[PDB]
Structure formats: C-alpha cells, structure tokens
Amino acid sequence: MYALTQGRIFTGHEFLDDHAVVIADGLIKSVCPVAELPPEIEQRSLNGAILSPGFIDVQLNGCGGVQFAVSVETLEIMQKANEKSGCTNYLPTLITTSDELMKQGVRVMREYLAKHPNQALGLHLEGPWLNLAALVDFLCENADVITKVTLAPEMVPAEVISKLANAGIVVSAGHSNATLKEAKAGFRAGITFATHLYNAMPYITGREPGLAGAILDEADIYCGIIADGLHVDYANIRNAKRLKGDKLCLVTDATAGSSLTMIEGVRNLVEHCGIALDEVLRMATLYPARAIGVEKRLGTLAAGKVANLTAFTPDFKITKTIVNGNEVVTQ
Amino acid sequence: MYALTQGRIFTGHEFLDDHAVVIADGLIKSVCPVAELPPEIEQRSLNGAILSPGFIDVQLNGCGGVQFNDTAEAVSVETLEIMQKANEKSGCTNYLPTLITTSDELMKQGVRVMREYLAKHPNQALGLHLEGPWLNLVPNFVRKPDAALVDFLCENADVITKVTLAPEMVPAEVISKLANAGIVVSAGHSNATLKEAKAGFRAGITFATHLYNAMPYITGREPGLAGAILDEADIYCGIIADGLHVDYANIRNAKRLKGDKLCLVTDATAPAGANIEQFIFAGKTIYYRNGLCVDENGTLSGSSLTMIEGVRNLVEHCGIALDEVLRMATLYPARAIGVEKRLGTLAAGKVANLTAFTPDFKITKTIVNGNEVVTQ
User: Fold this and answer.
1) According to its UniProt record, which residues of this chain constitute the active site (chain A)?
2) Dist CA A85 CA A261 (whole Å)
3) Rounded to a whole number, what is the distance in Å from the CA of B246 to chain A's nearest CA?
4) Domain B55-338: what homologous superfamily?
5) Which residues of A are annotated as a binding site for Zn(2+)?
6) How far apart are CA B316 and CA B185, in angstroms?
7) Chain B CB contacts of A197 below 8 Å
8) Taking CB atoms and an 8 Å cutoff, what residues of chain A touch B191?
9) Catalytic residue among B158, B267, B295, B323
10) Using a CB-CB distance cutoff of 8 angstroms, which residues of chain A are in contact with residue B252?
11) How many angstroms separate the CA atoms of A148 and A169, rounded?
12) Where in chain B is the domain with CATH 2.30.40.10?
C-alpha cells in the first residue's frame, strides 16, 4: 500500500491539488486529501507531474516494431511498448479474412487475458466485411474476448450487425463507402462506434454527407480520431470535437499508417486544437473506456477502479506509468 | 398609428403572448402588453398567426419570373420592383439582388439602376450583391484590370452591399479595400484550400456564399473552404434550405458549428414565385420541372425556394426550433450585412417591415414600412 502525492492529479472529472491517490492490491483504495492520509503509509512523489488514469488506445495495429506473430508474446511486447508512452490499455487489431487466423487470434487473446488482467483488453477484428453466417455465429460464441469489430455497413446484412451488438460486441463502422442513408441504417441495426473518423470513408459533399457526415450528425455514436496532424487536418478535428462532444476518442492508428503515441496525441490536441487539457485527457481515458464498456473498471481514478495510471510533466513527457498498482516505467 | 394583436409575436429574441406591436409612421413605435395599449388606437387582429420581422433574403437571383441578370433590359428598376412584390407574398420584405457578370458595362448599369431604385423605394431591395468576376469556374499581386474594378467598386460602396469572390483568385489588398469601403466581402465559387481560405478571412472576408455549394468537398486531409468556414467562429454564411442543394444532415451540422452565424438563403431564380417552365440564366438554359431547377443534362441549376418554404423546411426537417429558424431568416442576415439597427427585429425605432404566417406556414400578411402589402 502506498500513495502518490505532490502533483496535480486528474481523476477523470476534475483536477485535485493537494490530494493523494492511495494504491493497494492493484486497486485504487481511494483518492483523498494529503491531510486525510493515514500516517502509516508509504508516500511516492510525483514531482509536480500531472497524474491520470492510464490511456486507453482502442485502435492499435502495432508498436515497438511488431504487429498483430499473432501470439501472446506479441501481445505482451506491444503492452510494454505502449507503457513507455502512457498507454496502459489497448485493443490489438487483427486484419484478416482467414477464418483460421481469427480462431487462433480468439484463442490467443483468451490465453493472454488469463495471464495479464487489465492490459490488452480484447480483440478488435477488422475485416472481413470491408469495402477496399458461420462467421457471425463464431464471433458471437467468442464475444467474451472480442471487444469490437469494424465492418462496412453497406457490405453487411442488418441482422448480422444486430447479432454482434446483442452478443455484447462493439460494432464499428469503417473502411466503408457508405452513403448517409446506408450509414444510418447500420446505426439503427446496432452499430455504436465508427473507426478513425474521416479516414477510409468517403468525402463529405453538400449533396451526400456520407458516413462521416452521418457519424457527425448522430449524437449517440462514439468514434475515434487520429490526432497526428497527418491523417486528419486539425481543423477537422476541432469541428468534430464540437459536433461529437463527449463521444470523441483519441486513437493512434499506430503501427510498426501512423507512428503516433498517446501522449503525443494528447500534446497535439492541447496545443493545436485548443481543447482543454481536461477534455483531452477524457478523450484518452474516460471516453474510450465508456466506448468499449470497461468504464466501471478503467475509465477513472476512483475507489475500486483498477490502478492503471500514468504521470507526465507539463511539457508532456511521461515520468511514470503504473499498471495494476505496479510502477512499470520510471523517468 | 395602429397595433397588431391576438397572435404570438416573435421579436427576434423571444415569443410574446398577450402583447401588441404598435406601428406608426412606418416605424415600430413599441411592442408592449395589450393592456398597456392606449384606448385611442386602431387594433388589427392577427388571428393567432405568428408575427415576426420580415425575412431578409441575402442571396437572390430572381423571382416572379424575372432575373436581375443577363439581358441589359432585365437589369432595370422594374425588375427590382417585380422581385420585391414577389418576395412579399412569402414573407420576405428585404433582399439583395445578385448580379452575375464580368461586363464592366453591365456592372455600371447595375450600380446606376440600384441607386435609382434606392431613391424611389426605401427599406426594400437593400443593395447590390455582385457575383463575379473574381470567381473560379475553370497570387497576392494585383493586376491592372483588378485595380480599375476594385476602385470602381469602392466608389460605389453606398449601393453595393456585398461581392462574392474566390479567395485564391484575388490579392489580399483587394479584399481589404472592399472591406474598408464598408462592403461585405464574401467567399464563394472557389476551390480554395483551408489555408487559402483563412488568408482571405484575415484579409477582411466576413461572409461565405451558400455553404457547401460551389466549394470543394471536405476531406480529412483538406477541410477546404467549407471546413474553414465551419471552423471560423466570426464568419457569417448563408445556406440553402431546400433539401436539394444541401442534405439536411449537413445543415444540422452547420447550424451547430456556426450557431448564430448561419443565415437562411434561397439561391432562388425566376421560377420562385411564378409559373415559368424554362428560362435562361448565366448563359445556360434551365428548366423548372418538378419544382426542381435543372439543365439540359439534368444537373441542379438553381432553386425555386421562397423564404417561408425555407423556414418550414428548417423547422420540420432539421429539428431547429422555430425561434432560431426565424433568427436565421431575420436577425442573423440583418446582422451579416450591417442593417441590424434598423431591420433585424421588432423594436421601437426599427423599420416596420413585418410578416405574419399561420402555424402551417402560410403567409397571412406582409407589411413593408408600416403598410399592409399582402392580405390573405
């Protein structure tokens, strides 16, 4: 048991000043004022660094020189890499149509989940239904380890989208050339998330808003966006933020095609999109968490929540990362 | 002196219930409760109809079977007064005739005609809206021809309300001169990038012509002009609510991003308040078949939208409160062309230009300068 003190701590709702976060048994015992801290506890200093729950990256193809090979070692190498940049949780993406590769993926993730709690959260299946009956049932059978699947709403029957959504899987629209009507139909069918907004989607025109236009117009649809100043012009990010409010998540379509890390993403959103650091942090934690249904366990810094945290300096350099109450990065 | 009573009256800021609007000498004397009404005044009933300031249409090519374009016989004061009478039948009491042309000669006649009209008809057709020449249908250095034009335009800023130009095709100095002469410089019919667009805003542009139309597509890498307009908080812009030129979803997205800077416009052409089957416009031959202005090819070629139709469409298809819609057809446009302290609302001193319509959106009456000009 110990407490983190001497630094601004962001809980997910506000910034606390002279408080502390006491960690115990991999969980957050409580976040209280430094005064209320019992005298018998170890105190670990933050040195002024901002302390927040670890970032949750829900769209990751690979990092630290590896891509998902589809084994648990890859999964743990990616984890160690993400930590060096404040990311404590992520979703490995599996691009494939090989029903065989999918089974191995599902199997591998399941094996990993048993060994490593609160880290790689689950699979993100991209394909087959893209645009660039046995399957559906298979996917639902393994909804316990398949967190989300990306498909093109034009290329898929609505019944397929419903089944996936009822199995508790997050169905995402992406790599599509869908019209607004086509897009809206997929939302009614159960889709509740869109993969990296503005990318792999049609252009927005006045006559046809397209999928992006639909995502922007649908208030109840979460969606990720790549803040690297390369895949999406910052002006579009600002426009999206205003239209999507609390439904916009920061993602790094990171690979070995961006090379963006989450703090880099946080920095870019704060110094180029004029979004308050407070909101940006929610876009890298609370919102993604909320989007994949793990919020009552990972979105914030609160009693009972898993102790996955990250701390960085005002100039955006990771000073420390904590996974399950254990310091794993010290800078 | 008389007062309008018995109907919801929208002032521009809120809806009043048991109040009245007293008109006198073409002006609005005051908007007070029916009780506070002196006993010696004539009372005109609205019959439950909503009463609001007349609509201001800042992008109009023609209506009632006439256009203020092409043939030099059309660009006259009679056309200007026919368009006015037409607009009234649909609640529009003020507008800006658009003149598409590069004929320095046609421009002079236009400027001259507007000036003649302005002397005869106060608070109606407000001024010219020059579209072209600096467009991009097919460099911050100013050429010689640019200069003669610019200087001419500034000389006549008194009757030239706004000009539409493509920010890529024009030196910044030209945009500043126009803006300093008091003219509203608008971005439109452009293929400008966001950077190009932003440069024109810093140069003085403060308005964009019919958003999403005659502009590039918005992509992730390049937001384009539309993306810039949406991102710039201090830029007013018009938008065509006919469910044809812009999908209603884009309108909703724009409304949310532009807040009080979005104006309802009808890129209306001759068919508007008429029974025309086909007509010429911009050299192209356009057909009005199925309330849809198209060309030989079948491409959208203008609109036949009237302002109440626009108001109706925004209320029943964009989920925008009637209150806001009305601001988009009055207060905002007014604010955009700088006539707000005279026409945007129903308040003491403001010109008495009003329109009244039933809940099902039918104009029951239009008042210009305190005079009933439409009764239904």
Assistant:
1) 253 (proton donor/acceptor)
2) 6
3) 5
4) Metal-dependent hydrolases (3.20.20.140)
5) 126, 175, 196
6) 32
7) 220
8) none
9) B267
10) 217
11) 5
12) 1-54+339-376
Measure in Å the smallest separation between the Cα of A158 and chain B Cα atoms.
Answer: 22
CA distance B76 to B283: 19
Tokens of A40: 């018998």
The hierarchical CATH code for the domain A1-54+295-331 is 2.30.40.10
8 A C-beta contact, residue B354 and residue B53: yes
**Residue B101 near residue B109 (C-beta atoms within 8 A):** no
- Chain B hits for A235, Cβ within 8 Å: 194, 223, 227-228, 231
Burial of B359 (0-12, 13-18, 19+ CB in 10 A): exposed
Q: How many CB pairs under 8 A join A and B?
A: 73
> Looking at CA atoms only, how far is residue B243 from chain A in angstroms?
9
CA distances (Å), A302 to each of A14, A23, A251, B62, B196, in order?
12, 10, 24, 64, 47
CATH code given to domain B1-54+339-376: 2.30.40.10
Q: In chain A, list all ranges with CATH 3.20.20.140.
A: 55-294
Query: For residues A295 and A286, is the Cβ–Cβ distance under 8 A?
Result: yes
Method: X-ray
Residues carrying CATH 2.30.40.10, chain A: 1-54+295-331
- Strands A123-126 and A87-95, by their bridges, are parallel
A235–B256 CB contact, under 8 Å: no
Contact A128, A95 (CB under 8 A): no
Check A198 against B212: CB less than 8 A apart: no
- A207/B247 touch (CB, cutoff 8 Å), yes or no: yes
Note the CATH architecture for domain A55-294: Alpha-Beta Barrel (3.20)
